[PDB]
């Protein structure tokens, strides 16, 4: 239990593909859509999120991929 992104957030719309400030938090240091293990999301939730992020990337708002910066 490193940190669950379900808790660090109030309530939001999972079908909202424009809410970058939320969505941003379900991706990794790379653009990669986090695993349900780190998202804490339901089984149904994760599939919905999944599509919303895809929609939003295609819109230009979220990244397909990043580059890992050795921090």
């Amino acid at each position: 239990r490193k940190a669950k992104v379900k808790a660090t957030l109030g309530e939001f719309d999972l079908r909202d593909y424009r809410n970058v400030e939320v969505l941003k938090r379900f991706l990794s240091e790379t653009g990669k859509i986090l695993p349900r293990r780190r998202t804490g999301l339901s089984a149904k939730e994760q599939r919905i999120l999944a599509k919303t992020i895809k929609r939003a990337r295609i819109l230009g708002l979220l990244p397909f991929t990043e580059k890992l910066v050795r921090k």
């Binding site: 397909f64 991929t65 580059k67 890992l68 910066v69 050795r70």
Partner: protein, 115 residues
Amino acid sequence: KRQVASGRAYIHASYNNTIVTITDPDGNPITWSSGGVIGYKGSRKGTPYAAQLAALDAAKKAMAYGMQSVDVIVRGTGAGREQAIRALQASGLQVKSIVDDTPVPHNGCRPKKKF
């Protein structure tokens, strides 16, 4: 001839050989070096030592073009990718950043038989 203050150190390590080119902050290469340029033949180029060599010579040629600092970009999994870095790190160039940008296809060309 030219004078290059800061720059880029690109490190592309294969399982077979590790190449390091150094460029200007616009990304155009200045001098480069590999494991074979060091003067190795086959199996031996792809080696944490061969790579420690490739990097050192790369920065050697470089600091003669006035090189002072470098941002580092590694592309690839492979031997002495890590050695190439540390070689750069302790070469006399101040290492501003390190990044990995190994190209991962988002599922495109069917690979060769042995993958």
